[PDB]
Structures are given as structure tokens and as C-alpha cells.
Amino acid sequence: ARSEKRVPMTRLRKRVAERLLEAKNSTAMLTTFNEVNMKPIMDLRKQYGEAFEKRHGIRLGFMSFYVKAVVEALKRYPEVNASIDGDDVVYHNYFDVSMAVSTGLVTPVLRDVDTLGMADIEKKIKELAVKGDGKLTVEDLTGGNFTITNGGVFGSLMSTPIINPPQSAILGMHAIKDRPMAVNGQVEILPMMYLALSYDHRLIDGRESVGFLVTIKELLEDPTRLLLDV
Amino acid sequence: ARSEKRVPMTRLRKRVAERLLEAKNSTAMLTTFNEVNMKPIMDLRKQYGEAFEKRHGIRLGFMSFYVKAVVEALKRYPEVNASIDGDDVVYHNYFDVSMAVSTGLVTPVLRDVDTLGMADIEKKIKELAVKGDGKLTVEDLTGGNFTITNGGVFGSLMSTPIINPPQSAILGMHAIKDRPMAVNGQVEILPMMYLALSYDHRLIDGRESVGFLVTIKELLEDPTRLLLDV
Amino acid sequence: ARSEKRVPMTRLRKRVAERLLEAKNSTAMLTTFNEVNMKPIMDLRKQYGEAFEKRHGIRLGFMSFYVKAVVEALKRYPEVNASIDGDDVVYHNYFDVSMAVSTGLVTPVLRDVDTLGMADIEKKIKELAVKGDGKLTVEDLTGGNFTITNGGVFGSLMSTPIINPPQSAILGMHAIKDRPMAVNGQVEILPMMYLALSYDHRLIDGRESVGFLVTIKELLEDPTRLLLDV
Amino acid sequence: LGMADIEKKIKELAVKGDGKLTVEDLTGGNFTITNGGVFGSLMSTPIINPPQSAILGMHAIKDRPMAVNGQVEILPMMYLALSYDHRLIDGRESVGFLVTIKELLEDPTRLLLDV
């Protein structure tokens, strides 16, 4: 009933807090943005949804497309898939991608997503999403070379994600909103989504950060490009 | 007439500078953005402007709407209305909102805005705006749980506000510009304004920061929601 | 063939890294954004391109327009053209503008651009761009009061540039994209580009940062304003 | 001088025309610009002011049909007369001198680009 209520910082919250503070003071974090047209993917889902479910027992969603795109990007830009280890740059020759799941929020790791099929990525993601029960073992919460954080779920237009050290970058998805867009001289309404790539400028430079995000944009706007490799 | 002019840093400027530098190194500041359609409010003002003035002797402006919206948001998200006191989280059971007034810029405090009527908020805001004469006593400049900073006045499209410790977040208004928008399958021009909520990620998390801003968006786009509480 | 590859941080990369990290911890960097309509300039270039080339032997591009606009802005806001020297504010009475050229990226300096003609600025910029051969002497890489960094070249929509100490601000250009825009009640497609001005809030305040960017916007949207001084 | 400045100085002299015009003001000058549109002057022949070599005469701005990219449109047109001492200034120059004026007046931006 008094004007101020002091509640002791729980050890967990206290640990997290220090982490976040050191995450921002240890790195030279910067953020680059871009936008993507979710029309193509949304159509793929409308056309092959049922088929995909019957044939794989798992629903086709956005995530597998994002993860597939991220891996191809990580493949073209190993710098973004590397970490800084004191006086070293540790290039990882594998592809583990951390994926934020609500619970606070937690970062379970999808391992070797470069070898997984979409149905598979769709299943694993569900596993972790489901384990968020509270049965998330730290053997699940460790590692990861890159992180993808969703936020559209809340109605997030655009924002600045915080890096997750020792990782070098983080990709933040946002809400898909209809937005007027110029398309071949004509203005048309498309389901647009902003992408935010925050990165450690100590390791990753402009050209790369930009190109990394463009690549994601390209492969998401026409998944077929994954196949042709253009 | 020489190539360089060295002017000694005035003690005031020097104090401020150190503050700003420690404000950014002490916290894990992040920024989340969104946009609002100022059409509704602008209409309320056109329709009831005169009436409001005659009946209250004060002009109806944007501020009272922003402050009312902020308080309701602060009410739904006490975390954003709390501070971090060393090893504590101090939840404030009252509603003081700092409001940046030009002069440098100064942060006078509106106290217990949760009990004020719009006419009242309109008057108090004027008082402080007027005292910016230079009769601003520190009994006015202290406290505040949250801060609202206007910048549209200069033509600011969008930007990143800096937190004002010990406060946990800050809401930055910007210029209202006509922008094509998709409205029920049709593109229409609306008076849009971007909102930037910068916050201390040590205390406030994504879900909250996002939801906090969405709520503001919702209540500003239809003030009636304040009444129905939806 | 192993999962991790450790490559020693080269001394150069190591020096840079420390710099970037201290650039972000020493200052209270903030970023303000805006957008510009590149239609006007693009037309000037289409109309007078040939003429300009024949008469000056150098092609007319965007850069000279940006630099001319920046100088006029720097002239109206000396604070942005000043540095912080320990306990001092060093106002520079000259106009050197650092310009990022790819090679990593390097910041050659254009000296006294306030006295240069567009043809001249076009030539000098080419010199440095060409010396990027790798014949860039540090007598070229030193100094600079402000920095302009291009990124549209990569497809950069919008981003946050990092300040280059001892400098106080940095202007980041981005990709020019057609975007629907409201123009006198009618929606029309214009070649729009976002501008990001990051600045040291220890020295430069909102009003100034905003106004500095608006001015750039104004002079770029109608170069004639440089002549009339309005 | 900046335009604002030229605008002020011109006013000074226009105002001193009080009758406080000192010959220290009335001497010199390399070229002369004479306005006449003020009276409704369509076009005319200005007289040179020796020792000067030429003189530019402005005239009334009148709407006149004009061909503009295959289409006839009404524009606020004004004739320019450049009278000059042919002993020193030749055709090519007199013509080019006037064209240049025409160009820079039709698009002031050209002053900036220098084209």
C-alpha cells in the first residue's frame, strides 16, 4: 500500500542481468536492417500445407524456411558463423543455430541443421518448443553459432536484438504486416516483414553484415534459389 | 581566425556528459519501434477542440492523450514502471512521468498523472513548459518513473532515445507524416508517427517492451479503449 | 576437416577491433534517422550529365551533392563539426570530411571541401577511390571532422553507423529504393533513401542532430537551396 | 556577395535614390544592367555606358505562347538586349554572353553545377 515495493533480485535474474550488461560492453554491437516480402512463402504454405502434413506428419511453417535460409547465408559468410576467442577467430565448420523459445525466453540449439530436411527441422523445433514443460536440459541450451529470435508473435514492427556471446550475430524476425510497395512501377500491398541483423563489428564488417542480410532476403523471397544456388 | 578553437567544457556540460556516458555503460539499453495512426486523435481534437477550451480554459493537445496512454501501459506492465536499485527491483506504486521540455532540454516531472484529468494534464504540462522563464526548481526536476520525449517538433522521423537512469525505459514521439498505408486491402494515406521505446534489458524483456509499445499504439488509435479497458 | 578452425588474430585486425570497442564505450552514441527523395538529384544528373563531363572531364555523381550538403550542414551546426578533447570542445574552423572507400574499408580525407567545386570534388573522390591500388598514405587517412559512409552499394536499406573518434558524428547513406509516398494527397512512387546520423550525445544534442539531418534532407531534395541559402 | 546581400545593397542604392547618391557610388562599374520592364518595355536598344563595353537591358515579362516539346504552352517570357562595343566584343562572344545569361536564368541550379 506504500509508494515503493522493493523485491530482492533473484540469483537467476541477477546472473542474466550481468550477462546482458557484459554482452553490450564487451562487443561493438551494431544493427543493420532490411525487409522481406513474405508473399512467396505464404503461398508455398497454402499450396503444399496439407500434402506436407500427410507426408511428414508435421505442419509446414515459417521457421524451416528461415533456418534453411540462415544456413545458406552462414555458408556464404563464415565470418558471421565464427566467434572471437580472446586473440582468436574460431571458424565453426558445422551449423548449429540457436533458436529463442518462450517459457523467460530460452535459446535451445538446433544441431547440424545443414543436414536436416524441412520436415525434420519442423519436428525438432516443435520438440524444443514443447520442452518449453520446463524439461530443457543445459545439454540443449549450450552452443549455437548463430541465433534467430522471433518477435512478430507479439506485434513487433522492428527492433534491435542483442547479441548472444560468444556468438557474433543475431537475426530478429518481426510481425508480418501488409504494406504498400512499389512493384514494377505499380504500388501493390504485400505482406512485408523487417529483418534486423545485430552483429559484433569487431569481427563482422558492413559489406558482410549487409550481404548476409540481403542473402537471407533473397532466399526467403524465392526459396527456389536454394536449389539453383544463385 | 585559426583552424581550431578550444573552448573549456563548462562544469554543467561536463557533468551532463559523464552522466550520458554512464547511462549507456551501466545499462543494457535496447530499442523497439512501432508506428501509430494519429488520424483518430487528430479528429477528436478537430471535433471537440473549442468545447474543451471553453469548458476547461486549456487547449486540448496531443500530450494528454500520450500521458493517459502511457499510464495505462505502465499500469499493465509494472516492470517498465520499476527501477533497479543495486540488487533490487523497486516497483513504484505511483505514476510520475518525466516529460522533456526545451529550454538545453529539461525533464520536469508530472506527478500522479493517474489521477489527473486531461484538462489538468494539459494545464500542468503548460506550467512546466512555461517555467522553461528558467524558474525550474529541482523539486520539479527530480523523480519520474518513465520519460516521454517529443522530437517531432524538429522534424524527427524516427530515432533512438537514451534512457534516463534510474528510470528503466523512455518513449520517443516523432514527426507525424502522411504515409501510404494498407487499410483493409486498400492503400490510404494516414498521418503516421513512429514510436521508439528504448529500455533497460536488464529489467525489461522483449515480450514486455513489445507489448508495452503495442498497448500505447492501441490506446492512441482509439482512445475509447481507455474507457472499456480492452 | 575438424569442427573448429582457430586462426590467430592478425595485429591489424586486433588493433582495429580494440578501436571499435573503445569507440563504443568512450562515447554516448545514438542514431537518428530520416529519408530523402533522390528524384531531384537523379534528374539533375540525367539532364546535365554529358555537359558536365565534357566541360570538366569528370562524371557528375551523387557524392559531390552529398558532400556539398554536408558542408552546408556542418556550417550551420559547428557543434557537429567539433570534437571533444578531454575537457575541451575543439571547434574546427575548416571543413575536412572523411569518406569511406572500399579496399577492408578505409577513410581517406577530403580537405577543405568547402572551397571545392563539384567537378573538383568528383575528381578528388575518384583519386582516393582509385588509390584504394593500395597506395593510401596515412597523410591521406588522417584527420577529418565528419565522415560519410556509403552502403547502398551493397543493398543496405537502413542501418546504424559507428562513430569514428575523435569525430562527433557520421552520416550513413543507403540504397535508393522506389517506395510509395504521399505527395500532396496523392500516393506516388519515388526513389527514396534512408539517412542515418549517428552522433556523440556527449557533445551533440537532439535538436542539433535532428536539424542537422533535416538540413541535409532539404538541400538534397532541392540543390537550388544551396544557392539561395534557405 | 550572397543573394540576400545583393538584395540589401541594391535596396540601399535604390533608397539613396532621397538623393544622397555620392559620386563615390556613381563611379566605376565594368558592366551595366538596366531594367525597363517597370514601364512596360517589350524590347529595346540600350546605349553603352563608356568606358564600359556592353550593357544588358531587361524588359517586361509577358505571357507568350511558346513551343515546348512539340506542344504550345504559355510562358512568362522576357526579351534580353545586349548592346556592345563591337570594337572589342565580337559576335560569337556577344551571342554566347547572352545565351549564358539565358541558360543560368532558366535554371539557377546551373550556377552550382557549373554547366
mmCIF file of C-alpha atoms in Angstrom, chain A residues 39-205:
data_model
loop_
_atom_site.group_PDB
_atom_site.id
_atom_site.type_symbol
_atom_site.label_atom_id
_atom_site.label_comp_id
_atom_site.label_asym_id
_atom_site.label_seq_id
_atom_site.Cartn_x
_atom_site.Cartn_y
_atom_site.Cartn_z
ATOM 1 C CA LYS A 39 4.081 -13.442 -50.071
ATOM 2 C CA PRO A 40 6.044 -16.268 -51.823
ATOM 3 C CA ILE A 41 6.466 -18.380 -48.693
ATOM 4 C CA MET A 42 2.951 -17.737 -47.528
ATOM 5 C CA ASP A 43 1.781 -19.106 -50.874
ATOM 6 C CA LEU A 44 4.006 -22.190 -50.655
ATOM 7 C CA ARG A 45 2.400 -22.892 -47.352
ATOM 8 C CA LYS A 46 -1.147 -22.505 -48.714
ATOM 9 C CA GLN A 47 -0.460 -24.718 -51.714
ATOM 10 C CA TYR A 48 1.537 -27.539 -50.098
ATOM 11 C CA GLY A 49 0.431 -27.383 -46.457
ATOM 12 C CA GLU A 50 -1.835 -30.452 -46.398
ATOM 13 C CA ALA A 51 0.456 -32.504 -48.595
ATOM 14 C CA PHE A 52 3.425 -31.697 -46.393
ATOM 15 C CA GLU A 53 1.495 -32.699 -43.230
ATOM 16 C CA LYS A 54 0.210 -36.005 -44.624
ATOM 17 C CA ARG A 55 3.644 -36.914 -45.991
ATOM 18 C CA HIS A 56 5.649 -35.896 -42.925
ATOM 19 C CA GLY A 57 3.223 -35.739 -40.042
ATOM 20 C CA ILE A 58 4.476 -32.260 -39.239
ATOM 21 C CA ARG A 59 2.994 -28.921 -40.255
ATOM 22 C CA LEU A 60 4.983 -26.718 -42.666
ATOM 23 C CA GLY A 61 5.674 -23.355 -41.083
ATOM 24 C CA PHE A 62 7.895 -20.313 -41.479
ATOM 25 C CA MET A 63 10.781 -21.477 -39.270
ATOM 26 C CA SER A 64 12.188 -24.212 -41.541
ATOM 27 C CA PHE A 65 12.386 -21.639 -44.361
ATOM 28 C CA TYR A 66 14.205 -19.149 -42.085
ATOM 29 C CA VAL A 67 16.620 -21.790 -40.810
ATOM 30 C CA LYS A 68 17.353 -23.083 -44.329
ATOM 31 C CA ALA A 69 17.988 -19.515 -45.491
ATOM 32 C CA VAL A 70 20.199 -18.752 -42.469
ATOM 33 C CA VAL A 71 22.359 -21.850 -43.049
ATOM 34 C CA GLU A 72 22.912 -20.938 -46.699
ATOM 35 C CA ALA A 73 23.841 -17.417 -45.581
ATOM 36 C CA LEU A 74 26.130 -18.727 -42.844
ATOM 37 C CA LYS A 75 27.685 -20.908 -45.567
ATOM 38 C CA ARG A 76 28.441 -17.918 -47.786
ATOM 39 C CA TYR A 77 29.696 -15.795 -44.862
ATOM 40 C CA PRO A 78 31.776 -17.953 -42.451
ATOM 41 C CA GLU A 79 32.853 -14.788 -40.637
ATOM 42 C CA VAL A 80 29.298 -14.500 -39.264
ATOM 43 C CA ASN A 81 29.482 -18.180 -38.337
ATOM 44 C CA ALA A 82 32.733 -17.597 -36.405
ATOM 45 C CA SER A 83 33.424 -16.402 -32.856
ATOM 46 C CA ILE A 84 36.200 -14.324 -31.311
ATOM 47 C CA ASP A 85 38.141 -16.364 -28.727
ATOM 48 C CA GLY A 86 40.362 -13.909 -26.909
ATOM 49 C CA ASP A 87 43.000 -13.364 -29.581
ATOM 50 C CA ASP A 88 41.476 -15.848 -31.989
ATOM 51 C CA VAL A 89 38.725 -16.151 -34.552
ATOM 52 C CA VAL A 90 37.143 -19.558 -34.252
ATOM 53 C CA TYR A 91 35.556 -20.603 -37.527
ATOM 54 C CA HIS A 92 32.998 -23.323 -36.863
ATOM 55 C CA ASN A 93 32.853 -25.962 -39.617
ATOM 56 C CA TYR A 94 29.390 -27.066 -38.512
ATOM 57 C CA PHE A 95 25.968 -25.411 -38.388
ATOM 58 C CA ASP A 96 24.226 -25.129 -35.031
ATOM 59 C CA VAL A 97 21.646 -22.382 -34.842
ATOM 60 C CA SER A 98 20.229 -21.148 -31.560
ATOM 61 C CA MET A 99 16.502 -20.555 -31.610
ATOM 62 C CA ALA A 100 14.700 -18.455 -28.981
ATOM 63 C CA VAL A 101 11.718 -20.260 -27.434
ATOM 64 C CA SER A 102 9.345 -18.664 -24.876
ATOM 65 C CA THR A 103 8.914 -20.228 -21.414
ATOM 66 C CA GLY A 104 11.715 -16.221 -19.548
ATOM 67 C CA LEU A 105 12.840 -16.786 -23.130
ATOM 68 C CA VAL A 106 15.290 -19.631 -23.788
ATOM 69 C CA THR A 107 17.765 -20.431 -26.533
ATOM 70 C CA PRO A 108 17.594 -24.180 -27.384
ATOM 71 C CA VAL A 109 20.079 -25.292 -30.034
ATOM 72 C CA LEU A 110 19.261 -26.963 -33.349
ATOM 73 C CA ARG A 111 22.338 -29.000 -34.233
ATOM 74 C CA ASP A 112 23.585 -29.652 -37.763
ATOM 75 C CA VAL A 113 20.562 -28.019 -39.402
ATOM 76 C CA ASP A 114 22.542 -28.139 -42.618
ATOM 77 C CA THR A 115 21.757 -31.857 -42.796
ATOM 78 C CA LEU A 116 18.125 -31.631 -41.744
ATOM 79 C CA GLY A 117 15.149 -31.750 -44.059
ATOM 80 C CA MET A 118 12.379 -29.230 -43.618
ATOM 81 C CA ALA A 119 10.039 -31.793 -42.115
ATOM 82 C CA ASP A 120 12.807 -32.646 -39.684
ATOM 83 C CA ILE A 121 13.577 -29.041 -38.755
ATOM 84 C CA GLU A 122 9.844 -28.633 -38.251
ATOM 85 C CA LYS A 123 9.759 -31.555 -35.836
ATOM 86 C CA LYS A 124 12.884 -30.658 -33.809
ATOM 87 C CA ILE A 125 11.738 -27.080 -33.437
ATOM 88 C CA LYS A 126 8.464 -28.441 -32.069
ATOM 89 C CA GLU A 127 10.326 -30.700 -29.611
ATOM 90 C CA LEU A 128 12.208 -27.788 -28.084
ATOM 91 C CA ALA A 129 9.128 -25.562 -28.230
ATOM 92 C CA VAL A 130 7.264 -28.281 -26.331
ATOM 93 C CA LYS A 131 10.106 -28.899 -23.820
ATOM 94 C CA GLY A 132 9.467 -25.216 -23.051
ATOM 95 C CA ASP A 133 7.084 -28.347 -19.863
ATOM 96 C CA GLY A 134 10.363 -26.989 -18.478
ATOM 97 C CA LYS A 135 12.405 -30.064 -19.295
ATOM 98 C CA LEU A 136 15.093 -28.095 -21.114
ATOM 99 C CA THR A 137 18.450 -29.633 -20.178
ATOM 100 C CA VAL A 138 21.566 -27.465 -20.488
ATOM 101 C CA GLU A 139 22.889 -30.009 -22.969
ATOM 102 C CA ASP A 140 20.154 -28.432 -25.167
ATOM 103 C CA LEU A 141 20.833 -24.826 -24.123
ATOM 104 C CA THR A 142 24.535 -24.804 -24.956
ATOM 105 C CA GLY A 143 26.456 -23.992 -28.068
ATOM 106 C CA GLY A 144 24.904 -22.455 -31.143
ATOM 107 C CA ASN A 145 26.838 -20.429 -33.725
ATOM 108 C CA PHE A 146 24.074 -18.003 -34.638
ATOM 109 C CA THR A 147 20.699 -17.107 -33.114
ATOM 110 C CA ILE A 148 17.271 -16.413 -34.712
ATOM 111 C CA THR A 149 14.795 -14.651 -32.479
ATOM 112 C CA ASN A 150 11.109 -14.330 -33.334
ATOM 113 C CA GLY A 151 9.123 -11.365 -32.017
ATOM 114 C CA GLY A 152 6.367 -10.913 -34.554
ATOM 115 C CA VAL A 153 4.372 -13.081 -32.192
ATOM 116 C CA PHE A 154 3.957 -10.012 -30.003
ATOM 117 C CA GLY A 155 3.295 -7.497 -32.770
ATOM 118 C CA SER A 156 6.880 -6.287 -33.048
ATOM 119 C CA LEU A 157 7.276 -3.993 -36.070
ATOM 120 C CA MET A 158 11.072 -3.618 -35.949
ATOM 121 C CA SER A 159 13.727 -3.672 -33.187
ATOM 122 C CA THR A 160 17.384 -4.139 -32.129
ATOM 123 C CA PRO A 161 18.262 -7.691 -30.952
ATOM 124 C CA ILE A 162 21.101 -8.148 -28.507
ATOM 125 C CA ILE A 163 23.956 -10.487 -29.467
ATOM 126 C CA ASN A 164 24.360 -13.743 -27.546
ATOM 127 C CA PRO A 165 28.110 -14.129 -26.815
ATOM 128 C CA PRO A 166 30.219 -15.994 -27.707
ATOM 129 C CA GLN A 167 28.103 -15.762 -30.896
ATOM 130 C CA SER A 168 28.829 -12.974 -33.432
ATOM 131 C CA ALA A 169 25.400 -12.018 -34.739
ATOM 132 C CA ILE A 170 21.665 -12.446 -34.259
ATOM 133 C CA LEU A 171 18.716 -12.308 -36.697
ATOM 134 C CA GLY A 172 15.455 -10.880 -35.420
ATOM 135 C CA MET A 173 12.177 -11.643 -37.204
ATOM 136 C CA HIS A 174 9.206 -9.314 -36.738
ATOM 137 C CA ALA A 175 5.495 -9.079 -37.430
ATOM 138 C CA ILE A 176 4.314 -9.576 -40.981
ATOM 139 C CA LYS A 177 2.254 -6.548 -41.974
ATOM 140 C CA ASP A 178 0.607 -5.552 -45.230
ATOM 141 C CA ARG A 179 2.422 -2.529 -46.558
ATOM 142 C CA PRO A 180 2.073 -0.642 -49.843
ATOM 143 C CA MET A 181 5.083 -1.401 -52.014
ATOM 144 C CA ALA A 182 6.325 -0.337 -55.406
ATOM 145 C CA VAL A 183 6.371 -3.361 -57.679
ATOM 146 C CA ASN A 184 7.402 -2.717 -61.276
ATOM 147 C CA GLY A 185 6.101 0.868 -61.366
ATOM 148 C CA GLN A 186 2.873 -0.109 -59.668
ATOM 149 C CA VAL A 187 2.079 0.147 -55.969
ATOM 150 C CA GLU A 188 0.805 -3.108 -54.504
ATOM 151 C CA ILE A 189 0.099 -4.313 -50.985
ATOM 152 C CA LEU A 190 2.425 -7.086 -49.844
ATOM 153 C CA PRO A 191 2.910 -8.986 -46.532
ATOM 154 C CA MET A 192 6.154 -7.319 -45.532
ATOM 155 C CA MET A 193 8.460 -8.099 -42.591
ATOM 156 C CA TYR A 194 11.500 -6.163 -41.353
ATOM 157 C CA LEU A 195 14.685 -8.050 -40.558
ATOM 158 C CA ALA A 196 17.243 -6.840 -38.043
ATOM 159 C CA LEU A 197 20.721 -8.332 -38.023
ATOM 160 C CA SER A 198 22.733 -7.150 -35.000
ATOM 161 C CA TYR A 199 26.406 -8.143 -35.133
ATOM 162 C CA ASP A 200 29.797 -7.801 -33.465
ATOM 163 C CA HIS A 201 31.560 -5.224 -35.593
ATOM 164 C CA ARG A 202 34.860 -6.395 -34.064
ATOM 165 C CA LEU A 203 34.614 -9.459 -36.287
ATOM 166 C CA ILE A 204 31.895 -8.724 -38.872
ATOM 167 C CA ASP A 205 32.065 -5.711 -41.182
#
